[PDB]
Each structure stands twice: as C-alpha cells, then as structure tokens.
C-alpha cells in the first residue's frame, strides 16, 4: 500500500527539473533551495514524509561513482502544483571548514541540487521510508519539531492538512484536529516556507499553531540564543498534555542534535505526574506514533 523502492539505484528515474527556488531570503544564513522535479514519464508516486535518493553525478576522491544521498521529500503525494506530476525537495548547500582543509567545503550533492538548473535530468529513487507517515485519522494532533531542512516532512504534513487545492482534492483527509510546529532556523529570512506557514495558522488559528525559536534574533531565559529546545522546554507541559492523546503523533525532523534537549524537557513534564518518559516514548515509538528522522 505505501509505495516504496518503484526506482532503485541501479536503475533510478530520471526527473526534470522544473524549478529551482531559493528560501533563504535576504539576509538569511546559507543557501536552502525548493526544487520541483517532473516525475511525468515514470511511475514514481509517494505519500508524505517519505524520502527519495537523488545520485549526483560524478565521482569521489577514490574514482567511485557518488552514491544516492537521501532527501525529505517537501511536497504532497499530489506535488505542489496539485496534479500528481511533480515531487519536491527542500535542499541546504551544505557547508563546511578548515583547518581541517579548505577552508570552505561544499557537500556533493546538495551543491550539485542547489545549483541546479531547470530542465536538468536527475536521477531519483525511491520513495523510502515508512517511519515518517501521517496518521490517515483526520482528528489526529501532529507534533512537529523541525529545524532548518527538516521543515521538508513538515511541509507535506501540512499542505495535505491545509492548503485548498489538497482539501478539494482529498475527500478522505479534511483535517480537523490540532497540529503544532516548532520551527527552529537562525533567523527571520532562514524562516523556510514563512510566508505560506504564516497563511495556514492565519486561516487554521485552532488547528494550526506555529512556533519559531530563532537564534540569532531570541535569547532563551538562560540568556543563550534561543533553540527549538527551549521552546520545547518553555512548553513541555503543553506538549505533554497533548502527547499523552492517544492519537497524538510527534515527528521530530532535522540535523541530529536536538532530541537530547526535547526529551530532557518532557522527562522533566512528564514526570511531574510520575510518568518516565523514556518508557512512555518507547512505547509511543513502539505504537508509530514517535516519528523521528535526523541526519
Ligand atoms: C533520511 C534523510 C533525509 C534527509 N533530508 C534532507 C533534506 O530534506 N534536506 C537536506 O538538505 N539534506 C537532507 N539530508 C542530508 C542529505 O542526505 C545529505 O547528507 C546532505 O545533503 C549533504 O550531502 P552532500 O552530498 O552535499 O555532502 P557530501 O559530499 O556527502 O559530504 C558529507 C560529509 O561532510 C563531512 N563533514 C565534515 N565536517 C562536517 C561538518 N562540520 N558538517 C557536516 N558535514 C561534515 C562528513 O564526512 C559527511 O559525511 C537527509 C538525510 C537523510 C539520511
């Protein structure tokens, strides 16, 4: 039923580029692209919060060719056009330093995708991954705690949950219960998607709260730069409450790091009505409803 490995390295699709959009705005920090591949002429479908591999081309430092490299999928099964033709990707240039060696280092592939020019072929695999998947229950709550590029599965979530052309073209899917998004980037122009998250909770304010810890424009009350764990901590109770609905479902999608400080901040809501939270979440893990990717 969830589709999975219709394209495999061996034998990827190969996509066009239909557009290549920056979301970084003006003085934002790095580069994080919207891309939008054609998938017409291939049998390639997906549902939310799956991934697919893009391989780049070219070659390592050995002479081996590059491998697939794995990204979130950003759009509905539908893309973001809402005609079944297209997937998308929320793609950071990855960058890095010396010394070490360099100084700057560009990653292959996310430099490769977010330098990419409509109408190159790409190749895809996929879609993978079933740890990621949104409840078919329309009055399911949706925790989402992403930072930077793990906005991506978010997204999906919440265009199928939201935007009107999904709505008009998901009968089975109106969405009715509560959805929450702590949304952890460096700054305001690093705010991926602000505009169209911003015209969600505007329309869904019972439905839809969004949240942002900002680092280099909020300080946490400790006075350090605020990070999607301190609003964690500054709503544990909140989340806890909500976590303890037996159709609550939390996805927590990023680079790895954060989950030390999450879970730290529901131990401690958590344990305020003797619960242990590390048993509570093996279990919500256990059930499907602990959703975690982090790379
Ligand atoms: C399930 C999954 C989903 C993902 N979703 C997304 C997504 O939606 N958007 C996105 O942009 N990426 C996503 N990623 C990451 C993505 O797959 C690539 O790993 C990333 O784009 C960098 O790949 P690259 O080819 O550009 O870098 P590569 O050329 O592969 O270089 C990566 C290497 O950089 C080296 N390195 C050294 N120092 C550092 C440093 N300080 N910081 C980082 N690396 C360092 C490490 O050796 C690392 O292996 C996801 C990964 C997974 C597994």
Known sequence: ???????????????????????????????????????????????????????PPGVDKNGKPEKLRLYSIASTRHGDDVDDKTISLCVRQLEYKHPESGETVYGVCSTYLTHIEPGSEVKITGPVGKEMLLPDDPEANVIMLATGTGIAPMRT?????????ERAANPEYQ?????????????????????????????????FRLTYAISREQK??????????????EHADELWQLIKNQKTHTYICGLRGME????????????????????????????????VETY
Do not use: C
């Not at 009715?176 to 980037?185: E, Y």
């Not at 946490?220 to 901590?233: L, T």
């Open 220 to 233: 946490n009350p400790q006075g350090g730069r605020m990070y999607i764990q301190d609003r964690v901590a």
């Open 175 to 207: 969405f009715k219960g509560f959805s929450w998004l702590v949304f952890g980037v460096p700054t305001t122009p690093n705010i991926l998607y602000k505009e169209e998250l911003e015209e969600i909770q505007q329309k869904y304010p019972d439905n």
């Open 1 to 55: 039923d969830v589709p999975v490995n219709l394209y495999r390295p061996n034998a990827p699709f190969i996509g066009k580029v239909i557009s290549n959009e920056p979301l970084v705005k003006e003085g934002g920090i790095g580069i994080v692209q919207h891309i939008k591949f054609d998938l017409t002429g291939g049998n390639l479908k997906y549902i939310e919060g799956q991934a697919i591999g893009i391989i």
């Open 157 to 165: 979530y919440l265009w199928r949950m939201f935007k009107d052309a």
């Open 260 to 291: 030390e400080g999450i879970d730290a901040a529901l131990s401690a809501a958590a344990a305020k009505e003797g619960v242990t939270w590390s048993d509570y979440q093996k279990d919500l893990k256990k059930a499907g409803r602990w959703h």
